């Protein structure tokens, strides 16, 4: 078996925000932890306060579904990416788009920012990713080689610097400078829509309807499985304390232990009043910066906030 | 006890679907007009 | 009025085109508009319309309703499962035993000698119903066999030309 | 094989990157901060203000 | 996991005949109407 | 001269469908083997 | 790599929606291993969307549930997008921003479909949650109307006799009115061509026409289906109903006959006022001139207060109940004509490919709908005034009064309601209170709707078009009197019949 998993307390829902007019597809938190930002399929970008849950501001520039937002830690910039094939840079001292990155040939499914250099990486449905230069809007590399839409991309400072998962069920680890794939991982049988990197362990995990898998950098050596969540998995998100959240597309959300891979909670939330029951689904989840709150962006146009439960103990909720 | 179609309550209200203690904000139109920067600059 | 030939065209036309293209069907028929075709379908020729005798439960429910909701025959009719013209005739008939619009009437049968137009319509209805291939899918089908003349003629004439001793190049 | 065509939209524009200044939220401060306590602080404050609401 | 085929009422792209039955397949009354109508007759 | 009088059998639909089916309108003659 | 601009917004939405659907389940919730048929699930997706748009309940016999949930989820996505675009474009069209001529037509078509979906739901809910009018409101209404008609000594309208003298005059008027539509003699169509044919052959041979008409009125109770479409007036739409010719002629003649007889037997008292005696500017003059000729009207010494209220019945055409309407018509006409008129409002209404049945409200595109609207409004005038004050205003049946006059001054001042006008469904009332009647009203208002925090001054709506020296001055006695008067009037109307 295994040593026995660490005990983590369970999480309870405590807030439900509802102001969007279409599915909510992406969510992100500011560096300084005061507000978060959601992008939805009603083509707006709303900016909410993280303490009160009040809505501060609504930015409307896109022409279709906003499928990714991110907030840069080095500059007052928010980068958004839509299904209109366009990638935008909003400057948050005037709240206006100042820069737009052109060249993708179909909807852009996701986007990440490099933590030290000033580049962008975007993945799209033309089955390529691109490395953009933040400052001159010039595409410095087109990472090509997948054979179907590129569902997700994550980038890091260490090496390899870019991990993409795509719908042709493959993961690739790329080098940023050379611009070509070092490793191709074909263990999954179904589309890889979720990838996450451990904050402090040089390992990463990749989610698919088969099962989540863990891999070990820099050449992606298999480590273990995490099975039990049989659902189209849209997100993975890891805490610094080894909690791993796996959000599915039928609404169900499992919480796991990262190290031993032990699923310690299963949340099955409820749909907003006027919703059908075929419209429960999680599209994005994000931990707070204090790693205390867990925000989720759902297919019933709500944002649900979970906080940890403080009044439970190893004997109230034992570890099987 | 006839409910004019003007009422016709479908859709159990939120407190009944979520619980007695889960909070529920409904945020249509925003505060803080668009001219107000999110990150204020220095002077 | 409605003639058995016509509504037998209409059954087939609805069977082929679908239940929502009334202008096409109306075009299959001479002297009919799409409104009348649609009316005849929803009043008599629908296969879900019952022409049977009133079960005693049917008649009791009919009188019950006709008292709850008077003169609203379009509301009542589906509650018991026959068309409003049937309900109206049979209700007045019940009231009298205890005391136009040609869509509803049955179809005058076929004559011994069908008037010529009655015949050409059938042939042309037969014409329309058999043309499944996309009217262009007709044309290009003709074209595929059309050009085979071009190549077949050319070759023998090319064979014969070069056989006559002149080695032409097209380019 | 580099073209000499060109675009109205590829002219130089916004050629300097703004960096997050000392007070806005520089990676130094967020490297420092204690976030959990600050968050619970503002949370309690907001609940206070909204009970004053009623 | 078998998927039935669609027969639409709007699109017949290839011009195919389908019998009326299969073409076809793919009310409440309150009880206060009685009290109202009879109160009116009385 | 016209004589209107009830016909014998009828011109029911299936007959139209079968005749159109046997009209074979443009199946196509096969491409000739040479 | 060309951008997505304005002509490719819809085509691109559908590109990306069906790419998403193909990713979604048909390759990530399969195990229909062999060939997962995704090209056929997309066909189901398109047909579910057309069925949404037609308001058809879509249910496929044996179709795995995960697929059905996927499809229902995506049709709700496209429906949200579609109607949010309709809301947005409607605001642009209303305030005036776009003149594009494809958006005007696309948007009229979108909102026609949205109206008919809401309407089929409203008729289904009627037939399910049953008559919204209880059996005690309906009986009060019926008995009050009988008391009115009996006190007036009304003389019910008979079925038009065989040798009526005026049948050809009434028919000539009907046919001239129907011709007045195609004055232009335009490009019209087949159906207007057919109507003109019927009108001309009835103008030539007027007795086969009238024989047909009376046969209809006697025997027919199930009619053809009506068409609806909307007339776009850029700040609201108007429904326009399309009835078939044979019945249009029968209805036009019935209309003329009813209005003629009603005017001869004096059905409508003098306050029901789109009347044939003056144009609307003369109504405004007579109203201003009647207010001014009340007795001691402008005097304020003893603290009297005049109140002018004006409102709207807020939907009377839409909550008429055809059973109650049948019974209320039978008090007035022959049961044959009453049955014709109420069996004629219950027809099938059809737009492009949506069809439903009217069962609850009233179709205003009929030709006798004026008579139904004004008679029903008469019943509601009685509910609002009371039989006694209605008999004071209308005067004795041997000596009826004029528009805004009374018999003597004694009766006129015996009650707060001094004047009352009702345009088709619009209500204008003029009260004159003494200080005690006013104080009493305010007390009973404040008892039931207590405002201790003095925000009654806030909801009050003024006319921001005259200068403030001429607007209304909101002292608490005044705005409280205003609210009290309005609260008192909106209490005389059951909310299941009409509201205010």
Curated annotation (Swiss-Prot), chain A:
The modification Phosphoserine is found at residues 18, 208. One of its GO terms (biological process) is mRNA splicing, via spliceosome. It is found in: Nucleus; Nucleus speckle. One of its GO terms (cellular component) is spliceosomal complex. Its main location: nucleus. WD repeats lie at residues 19-58, 61-100, 103-142, 145-184, 187-227, 228-266, 277-316. Keywords: Acetylation, mRNA processing, mRNA splicing, Nucleus, Phosphoprotein, Repeat, Spliceosome, WD repeat. The keyword Transcription does not apply. Identified in the spliceosome C complex. Component of the PRP19-CDC5L splicing complex composed of a core complex comprising a homotetramer of PRPF19, CDC5L, PLRG1 and BCAS2, and at least three less stably associated proteins CTNNBL1, CWC15 and HSPA8. Interacts (via its WD40 repeat domain) directly with CDC5L (via its C-terminal); the interaction is required for mRNA splicing but not for spliceosome assembly. Component of the minor spliceosome, which splices U12-type introns. Within this complex, interacts with CRIPT. Also interacts directly in the complex with BCAS2 and PRPF19. Belongs to the WD repeat PRL1/PRL2 family. Involved in pre-mRNA splicing as component of the spliceosome. Component of the PRP19-CDC5L complex that forms an integral part of the spliceosome and is required for activating pre-mRNA splicing. As a component of the minor spliceosome, involved in the splicing of U12-type introns in pre-mRNAs. This is Pleiotropic regulator 1. The lineage of its organism: Eukaryota, Metazoa, Chordata, Craniata, Vertebrata. The gene is PLRG1.
From Swiss-Prot, chain B:
It comes from the Eukaryota. The modification Phosphothreonine is found at residue 31. It is found in: Nucleus. There is a cross-link at residue 9 (Glycyl lysine isopeptide (Lys-Gly) (interchain with G-Cter in SUMO1)). There is a cross-link at residue 9 (Glycyl lysine isopeptide (Lys-Gly) (interchain with G-Cter in SUMO2)). It is linked to Mandibulofacial dysostosis with microcephaly: A rare syndrome characterized by progressive microcephaly, midface and malar hypoplasia, micrognathia, microtia, dysplastic ears, preauricular skin tags, significant developmental delay, and speech delay. Many patients have major sequelae, including choanal atresia that results in respiratory difficulties, conductive hearing loss, and cleft palate. Required for pre-mRNA splicing as component of the spliceosome, including pre-catalytic, catalytic and post-catalytic spliceosomal complexes. Component of the U5 snRNP and the U4/U6-U5 tri-snRNP complex, a building block of the spliceosome. As a component of the minor spliceosome, involved in the splicing of U12-type introns in pre-mRNAs. Belongs to the TRAFAC class translation factor GTPase superfamily. Classic translation factor GTPase family. EF-G/EF-2 subfamily. This is 116 kDa U5 small nuclear ribonucleoprotein component. It comes from Homo sapiens (Human). The chain holds residues 56 to 98 of 972 of the full protein.
From Swiss-Prot, chain C:
There is a cross-link at residue 105 (Glycyl lysine isopeptide (Lys-Gly) (interchain with G-Cter in SUMO2)). Signal peptide: none annotated. Residues 1-47, 48-99 form the HTH myb-type domain. Residues 22-45, 73-95 bind DNA. Changing residue 73 to G: Abolishes DNA-binding. Ubiquitously expressed in both fetal and adult tissues. Disulfide bonds: none annotated. Phosphorylated on serine and threonine residues. Has no effect on subcellular location nor on homodimerization. Phosphorylated in vitro by CDK2. Phosphorylation enhances interaction with PPP1R8. It is found in: Nucleus; Nucleus speckle; Cytoplasm. It is linked to A chromosomal aberration involving CDC5L is found in multicystic renal dysplasia. Translocation t(6;19)(p21;q13.1) with USF2. DNA-binding protein involved in cell cycle control. May act as a transcription activator. Plays a role in pre-mRNA splicing as core component of precatalytic, catalytic and postcatalytic spliceosomal complexes. Component of the PRP19-CDC5L complex that forms an integral part of the spliceosome and is required for activating pre-mRNA splicing. The PRP19-CDC5L complex may also play a role in the response to DNA damage (DDR). As a component of the minor spliceosome, involved in the splicing of U12-type introns in pre-mRNAs. Belongs to the CEF1 family. This is Cell division cycle 5-like protein. It comes from Homo sapiens. The gene is CDC5L.
Curated annotation (Swiss-Prot), chain E:
It is found in: Nucleus. The gene is SNW1. This is SNW domain-containing protein 1. Belongs to the SNW family. Transmembrane segments: none annotated. Involved in pre-mRNA splicing as component of the spliceosome. As a component of the minor spliceosome, involved in the splicing of U12-type introns in pre-mRNAs. Required for the specific splicing of CDKN1A pre-mRNA; the function probably involves the recruitment of U2AF2 to the mRNA. May recruit PPIL1 to the spliceosome. May be involved in cyclin-D1/CCND1 mRNA stability through the SNARP complex which associates with both the 3'end of the CCND1 gene and its mRNA. Involved in transcriptional regulation. (Microbial infection) Is recruited by HIV-1 Tat to Tat:P-TEFb:TAR RNA complexes and is involved in Tat transcription by recruitment of MYC, MEN1 and TRRAP to the HIV promoter. There is a cross-link at residues 14, 35 (Glycyl lysine isopeptide (Lys-Gly) (interchain with G-Cter in SUMO2)). The chain holds residues 245 to 293 of 536 of the full protein.
